[PDB]
Structures are given as structure tokens and as C-alpha cells.
């Protein structure tokens, strides 16, 4: 089952910018059919900071219909971009190659002005 392989492992997913999400799932102690999402994200998007090193991710996954929401704070040992991104979406296992379709928000500052920027990432499974 493609949903069960997802839960059993540490799968990698590459988006249209060449960035890579690696997900690991741990059962929630209180929420049925729900998993704590851990793993890491490597940003390879041209024109951005915090590229080429793993950032931890966190969030939650609903196994009933394979919906996920996860976040990265852009702070690690290598680089700090003083921002955070949240992705929310769903997995589609219906094709020969699995895809994760997401919308994201990036919160950040430009000078003293805060902003939240929107976008979309489509991740294709690495197999």
C-alpha cells in the first residue's frame, strides 16, 4: 500500500525548485489516524538564502485521506534567514509516480516591515 510505505519509512520528495523534503511519521498519542511529522528540508531554490543544508521540519499528517501540514523555521548551524514557512496539502498516489501538492506561506521581515508571501510547491516522489 503506498500510504503504508509512506508511514513505514523516510521518503524523499523533490519540488519544482529542486528542493527536497524528507518525511518521517510517528503515531500521535491522542489523535486517531494522525501522525507527528518530522524530517528535514533542503532548499535549492534559486535567489534565496539558506540553501543546500537541512532544516528540521515539524507538523502533522492525517492518514485517512493522506493530508499533511508541516513547517520549517529557517534557523540552523549553517544559516539563519529569520523566517518560517508552512506548507499544507495532500498526497496523490493515483499516478505511476506519487505527488505531494501544497500551498505555502512564508513569514519574514523586510527591514522593520513584516510580510507573509504565498506560493505553491508540487513535490514528486524520489524512487
Amino acid at each position: 500500500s503506498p500510504d503504508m510505505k509512506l508511514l513505514a519509512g523516510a521518503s524523499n520528495w523533490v519540488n519544482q525548485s529542486g528542493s527536497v523534503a524528507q518525511f518521517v511519521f510517528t503515531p500521535s498519542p491522542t489523535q486517531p489516524q494522525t501522525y507527528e511529522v518530522s524530517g528535514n528540508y533542503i532548499n535549492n531554490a534559486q535567489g534565496t538564502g539558506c540553501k543546500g543544508t537541512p532544516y528540521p521540519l515539524s507538523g502533522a499528517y492525517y492518514s485517512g485521506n493522506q493530508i499533511i501540514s508541516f513547517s520549517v523555521v529557517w534557523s540552523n548551524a549553517s544559516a539563519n534567514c529569520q523566517s518560517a514557512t508552512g506548507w499544507t496539502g495532500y498526497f496523490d498516489f493515483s499516478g505511476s509516480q506519487a505527488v505531494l501538492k501544497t500551498d505555502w506561506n512564508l513569514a519574514f521581515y523586510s527591514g522593520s516591515t513584516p510580510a507573509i508571501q504565498q506560493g505553491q510547491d508540487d513535490f514528486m516522489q524520489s524512487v
Binding site: 534565496t48 538564502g49 534557523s75 540552523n76 544559516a79 539563519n80 529569520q82 523566517s83 512564508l106 519574514f108
Partner: peptide, 10 residues
Amino acid sequence: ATVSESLLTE
């Protein structure tokens, strides 16, 4: 770490 103003701008 190296510090950037944001993810978008150095």
C-alpha cells in the same frame, strides 16, 4: 550561522 535579512533577501 550566516545571517540573512529574510529567506528572499540577503
